[PDB]
Design an enzyme around this catalytic site. Structure first.
Site, PDB file in Angstrom:
ATOM      1  NE  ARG A 111      46.978  53.303  63.419  1.00  0.00           N
ATOM      2  CZ  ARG A 111      46.583  52.318  64.206  1.00  0.00           C
ATOM      3  NH1 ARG A 111      47.476  51.422  64.642  1.00  0.00           N
ATOM      4  NH2 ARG A 111      45.322  52.240  64.587  1.00  0.00           N
ATOM      5  CG  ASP A 112      48.818  57.565  62.363  1.00  0.00           C
ATOM      6  OD1 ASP A 112      49.182  56.726  61.505  1.00  0.00           O
ATOM      7  OD2 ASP A 112      47.630  57.534  62.689  1.00  0.00           O
ATOM      8  CD  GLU A 161      43.409  55.295  63.387  1.00  0.00           C
ATOM      9  OE1 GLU A 161      42.386  55.809  62.843  1.00  0.00           O
ATOM     10  OE2 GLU A 161      43.941  54.247  63.017  1.00  0.00           O
ATOM     11  CB  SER A 163      49.379  58.313  58.364  1.00  0.00           C
ATOM     12  OG  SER A 163      48.283  58.118  57.423  1.00  0.00           O
ATOM     13  CD1 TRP A 210      38.979  55.429  59.480  1.00  0.00           C
ATOM     14  CD2 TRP A 210      38.973  54.064  57.724  1.00  0.00           C
ATOM     15  NE1 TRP A 210      40.191  55.545  58.847  1.00  0.00           N
ATOM     16  CE2 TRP A 210      40.213  54.692  57.777  1.00  0.00           C
ATOM     17  CE3 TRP A 210      38.728  53.150  56.706  1.00  0.00           C
ATOM     18  CZ2 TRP A 210      41.200  54.455  56.858  1.00  0.00           C
ATOM     19  CZ3 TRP A 210      39.726  52.899  55.791  1.00  0.00           C
ATOM     20  CH2 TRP A 210      40.947  53.541  55.886  1.00  0.00           C
ATOM     21  CD1 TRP A 223      43.596  51.907  53.987  1.00  0.00           C
ATOM     22  CD2 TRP A 223      44.129  49.744  53.900  1.00  0.00           C
ATOM     23  NE1 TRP A 223      44.714  51.721  54.768  1.00  0.00           N
ATOM     24  CE2 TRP A 223      45.073  50.409  54.713  1.00  0.00           C
ATOM     25  CE3 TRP A 223      44.264  48.338  53.711  1.00  0.00           C
ATOM     26  CZ2 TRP A 223      46.155  49.726  55.350  1.00  0.00           C
ATOM     27  CZ3 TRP A 223      45.327  47.662  54.346  1.00  0.00           C
ATOM     28  CH2 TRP A 223      46.268  48.383  55.145  1.00  0.00           C
ATOM     29  CD  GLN A 244      48.660  56.194  54.689  1.00  0.00           C
ATOM     30  OE1 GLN A 244      49.787  56.528  54.284  1.00  0.00           O
ATOM     31  NE2 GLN A 244      48.415  55.040  55.250  1.00  0.00           N
ATOM     32  CG  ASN A 287      43.644  55.865  54.173  1.00  0.00           C
ATOM     33  OD1 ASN A 287      43.995  55.122  53.243  1.00  0.00           O
ATOM     34  ND2 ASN A 287      44.226  55.819  55.399  1.00  0.00           N
ATOM     35  CG  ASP A 288      45.047  58.695  57.395  1.00  0.00           C
ATOM     36  OD1 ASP A 288      43.888  58.181  57.217  1.00  0.00           O
ATOM     37  OD2 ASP A 288      45.764  58.311  58.338  1.00  0.00           O
TER      38      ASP A 288
HETATM   39  C1  LIG Z   1      47.089  45.815  45.384  1.00  0.00           C
HETATM   40  O1  LIG Z   1      47.538  46.094  44.060  1.00  0.00           O
HETATM   41  C2  LIG Z   1      47.326  44.994  43.152  1.00  0.00           C
HETATM   42  C3  LIG Z   1      48.051  45.282  41.843  1.00  0.00           C
HETATM   43  O2  LIG Z   1      49.456  45.229  42.127  1.00  0.00           O
HETATM   44  C4  LIG Z   1      45.864  44.646  42.981  1.00  0.00           C
HETATM   45  O3  LIG Z   1      46.061  43.477  42.216  1.00  0.00           O
HETATM   46  C5  LIG Z   1      45.154  42.505  41.740  1.00  0.00           C
HETATM   47  O4  LIG Z   1      43.795  42.795  41.840  1.00  0.00           O
HETATM   48  C6  LIG Z   1      43.230  43.726  40.911  1.00  0.00           C
HETATM   49  C7  LIG Z   1      41.677  43.710  40.977  1.00  0.00           C
HETATM   50  O5  LIG Z   1      41.125  45.026  40.854  1.00  0.00           O
HETATM   51  C8  LIG Z   1      43.686  43.519  39.478  1.00  0.00           C
HETATM   52  O6  LIG Z   1      43.257  44.690  38.800  1.00  0.00           O
HETATM   53  C9  LIG Z   1      45.205  43.359  39.428  1.00  0.00           C
HETATM   54  O7  LIG Z   1      45.652  43.055  38.134  1.00  0.00           O
HETATM   55  C10 LIG Z   1      45.630  42.214  40.302  1.00  0.00           C
HETATM   56  N1  LIG Z   1      47.102  42.069  40.133  1.00  0.00           N
HETATM   57  C11 LIG Z   1      47.935  41.535  41.057  1.00  0.00           C
HETATM   58  C12 LIG Z   1      49.406  41.846  40.959  1.00  0.00           C
HETATM   59  O8  LIG Z   1      47.549  40.831  41.981  1.00  0.00           O
HETATM   60  C13 LIG Z   1      45.266  44.352  44.350  1.00  0.00           C
HETATM   61  O9  LIG Z   1      43.873  44.202  44.177  1.00  0.00           O
HETATM   62  C14 LIG Z   1      45.562  45.502  45.335  1.00  0.00           C
HETATM   63  N2  LIG Z   1      44.968  45.350  46.660  1.00  0.00           N
HETATM   64  C15 LIG Z   1      43.832  45.955  47.025  1.00  0.00           C
HETATM   65  C16 LIG Z   1      43.309  45.557  48.376  1.00  0.00           C
HETATM   66  O10 LIG Z   1      43.188  46.774  46.333  1.00  0.00           O
HETATM   67  O1  LIG Z   2      46.252  53.833  55.976  1.00  0.00           O
HETATM   68  C1  LIG Z   2      46.640  53.477  57.308  1.00  0.00           C
HETATM   69  C2  LIG Z   2      46.597  54.784  58.093  1.00  0.00           C
HETATM   70  O2  LIG Z   2      45.253  55.188  58.230  1.00  0.00           O
HETATM   71  C3  LIG Z   2      44.917  55.526  59.543  1.00  0.00           C
HETATM   72  O3  LIG Z   2      44.515  54.251  60.102  1.00  0.00           O
HETATM   73  C4  LIG Z   2      43.805  56.463  59.978  1.00  0.00           C
HETATM   74  O4  LIG Z   2      42.878  56.694  58.930  1.00  0.00           O
HETATM   75  C5  LIG Z   2      46.231  55.738  60.260  1.00  0.00           C
HETATM   76  O5  LIG Z   2      46.151  55.598  61.675  1.00  0.00           O
HETATM   77  C6  LIG Z   2      47.159  54.782  59.492  1.00  0.00           C
HETATM   78  O6  LIG Z   2      48.456  55.311  59.416  1.00  0.00           O
END
Ligand SMILES: *[C@@H]1O[C@H](CO)[C@@H](O[C@H]2O[C@H](CO)[C@@H](O)[C@H](O)[C@H]2NC(C)=O)[C@H](O)[C@H]1NC(C)=O
Ligand SMILES: OC[C@H]1O[C@](O)(CO)[C@@H](O)[C@@H]1O
Ligand SMILES: *[C@@H]1O[C@H](CO)[C@@H](O)[C@H](O)[C@H]1NC(C)=O
Ligand SMILES: *[C@@H]1O[C@H](CO)[C@@H](O)[C@H](O)[C@H]1NC(C)=O
Ligand SMILES: *[C@@H]1O[C@H](CO)[C@@H](O)[C@H](O)[C@H]1NC(C)=O
Length: 517
Positions: A169-170, A222, A84, A316, A46, A38, A21-22
């Protein structure tokens, strides 16, 4: 890395993989434009939020670098994410973080704490707390050390807003020459208000003013910023605040977008000009009238006539579900920032800031002029996926609309229309049939922005098309409209459409743009 994927912008930044993102930490230093962002190093949506990093010499040919600030606990239980923020070159070493090498670069960012904990500084934070923290780099941004002894350096929102600890934030920090102080602008996001602080050292901060709310308030505030811009051609200047809100973006859109205010700043207080604020809570100055221009942030380290903002080219509302792989999201074309007096009003004008001559064919693939363009649609041309269109035409035409149909299948049942409504004096961008629109119901929409003809009656549009985007610069740049599109592989056709009548004095040129990757 091979970036030849469907929908991969070839002249917009995106990370090789994963979610972005940002834009963050925008700083020009010793010939280099830094682009932090981000970033999820663990996924395509995210999460695990970190500051990624890329550099260029020209805002165009980017090189992706190692992760700058990697979520603390990444791969284990995450305890701190790096929301951010911004970055400055502390050349005089006011922070003290310099040693016997380089002076430090210092990053100021929002720490997000997903779990309650006591920090190395001895401070206690609550679950989902947002606080302002700093890190430094002694190798020109490659690697970063967080200021663990004292972070966060701004733990709480100002009184009486202590309850806002989850939405604070930001930080945009910058050196204010006139007061010889560091200034930072933060967002008390739910309250639609910014809090401004100063410092002599980047560590110790004093609240000096609050700004807002005004104008658009239909979403959380933001990504605040504050910069001095030139006005017109003489030596006049004005300060400009840019700020995002989500949702409550521009008329015609659903979701996020970017507004601004023109005024003056005295080192402590931003005073909006009388004509930048509008009675009520709806009307605003939009930086961009399209759906996909958000989290727009300015570069530190640039001079008065060289200022640049970068925006996140996504929304978003639906950003998590764009049909991209193995990355998600791109930045928009970097935007040169200035002010022009238009219709007796200081108005933000943007220019598309890349090194176009390094990547654009000099000879147009299509070029025509028409004293009178007949009602109907012209013969088809083939453009490829990456190109610029220049159009100009008379505001006095009898057509209801004049437009280019582009990224069109051969029978134009798939297409994106970019044009002008003569009666409404508005730019439109119709992506209702632009290709894949299946992933959100608000995506298949027509967008609009105001654009008065020039003094001679001429409407000018410059349109940049890349694999999944369209960006429209109207007039001198006073109205931009930014919109993602996801066309099929065959959607590489174009033609001109004069609907409901003729269009007078038409000039149309299309130039191919090469990849920057
Ligand atoms: C944050 O990062 C982790 C890896 O550190 C992601 O971890 C899990 O989920 C994935 C699914 O796509 C697997 O590929 C990873 O192996 C698995 N590993 C761990 C450590 O949990 C996790 O999805 C991420 N969070 C987001 C919201 O994307
Ligand atoms: O990723 C989190 C960040 O993204 C934003 O929400 C806006 O897109 C920020 O306000 C925040 O710092
Ligand atoms: C660095 O010091 C010089 C001399 O005091 C001054 O001109 C400048 O504003 C200082 N600060 C920065 C960030 O350049
Ligand atoms: C459209 O352009 C093509 C390619 O130049 C050409 O073959 C064709 O004759 C054109 N059609 C008309 C009606 O001009
Ligand atoms: C338009 O062309 C596409 C093939 O790309 C096809 O699926 C569709 O049927 C065509 N539509 C019409 C109305 O001819």
């Amino acid at each position: 890395f091979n970036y030849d994927q469907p929908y991969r912008g070839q002249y917009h930044f995106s990370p090789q993989k994963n979610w972005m993102n940002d834009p963050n930490g925008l700083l020009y230093h010793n010939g280099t434009y830094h682009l932090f962002f981000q970033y999820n190093p663990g996924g395509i949506e995210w999460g695990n939020i970190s500051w990624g990093h890329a550099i260029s010499e020209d805002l165009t040919h980017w090189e992706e670098k190692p992760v700058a600030l990697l979520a603390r606990g990444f791969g284990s239980d995450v305890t701190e994410m790096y929301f951010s923020g911004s970055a400055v070159a502390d050349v005089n070493n006011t922070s003290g973080f310099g040693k016997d090498g380089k002076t430090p670069l210092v990053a100021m960012y929002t720490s997000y704490y997903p779990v309650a904990q006591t920090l190395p500084s001895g401070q206690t934070v609550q679950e989902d707390q947002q606080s302002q923290s700093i890190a430094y780099s002694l190798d020109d941004g490659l690697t970063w050390t967080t200021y663990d002894a004292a972070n966060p350096v701004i733990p709480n929102p100002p009184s009486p807003y202590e309850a806002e600890y989850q939405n604070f934030r930001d930080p945009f920090v910058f050196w204010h020459d006139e007061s010889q102080k560091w200034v930072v602008v933060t967002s008390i996001a739910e309250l639609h208000k910014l809090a401004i602080y100063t410092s002599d050292n980047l560590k110790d901060w004093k609240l000096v003013s609050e700004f807002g709310p005004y104008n658009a308030q239909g979403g959380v505030w933001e990504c605040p910023g504050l910069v001095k811009l030139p006005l017109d051609s003489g030596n006049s200047t004005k300060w400009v605040i840019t700020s995002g809100l989500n949702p409550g973006g521009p008329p015609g859109t659903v979701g996020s977008g970017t507004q601004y205010f023109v005024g003056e700043f005295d080192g402590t207080t931003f005073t909006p000009d009388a004509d930048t604020v509008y009675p009520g809570n709806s009307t605003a100055n939009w930086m961009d009238w399209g759906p996909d221009f958000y989290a727009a942030a300015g570069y530190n380290g640039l001079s008065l006539n060289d200022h640049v903002h970068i925006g996140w080219m996504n929304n978003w509302q639906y950003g998590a579900n764009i049909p991209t792989y193995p990355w998600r999201s791109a930045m928009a074309i970097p935007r040169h920032m200035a002010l022009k007096t238009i219709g007796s009003k200081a108005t933000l004008v943007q220019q598309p800031q890349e090194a176009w001559s390094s990547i654009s064919n000099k000879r147009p693939i299509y070029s025509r002029t028409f004293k009178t363009l007949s009602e109907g649609s012209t013969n088809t041309t083939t453009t490829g996926e990456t190109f610029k269109v220049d159009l100009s035409f008379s505001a006095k035409s009898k057509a209801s609309t004049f437009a280019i149909a582009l990224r069109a299948s051969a029978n134009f049942t798939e297409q994106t229309l970019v044009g002008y409504d003569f009666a409404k004096q508005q730019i439109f961008l119709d992506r209702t049939h632009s290709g894949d629109v299946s992933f959100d119901e608000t995506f298949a929409s027509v967008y609009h922005g105001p654009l008065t003809p020039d003094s001679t009656g001429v409407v000018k549009l410059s349109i940049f098309v890349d694999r999944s985007s369209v960006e429209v610069f109207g007039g001198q740049g006073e109205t931009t409209l930014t919109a993602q599109i996801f066309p099929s592989s065959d959607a590489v056709h174009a033609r001109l459409a004069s609907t409901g009548g003729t269009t007078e004095d038409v000039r149309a040129d299309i130039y191919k743009i090469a990849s920057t990757w």
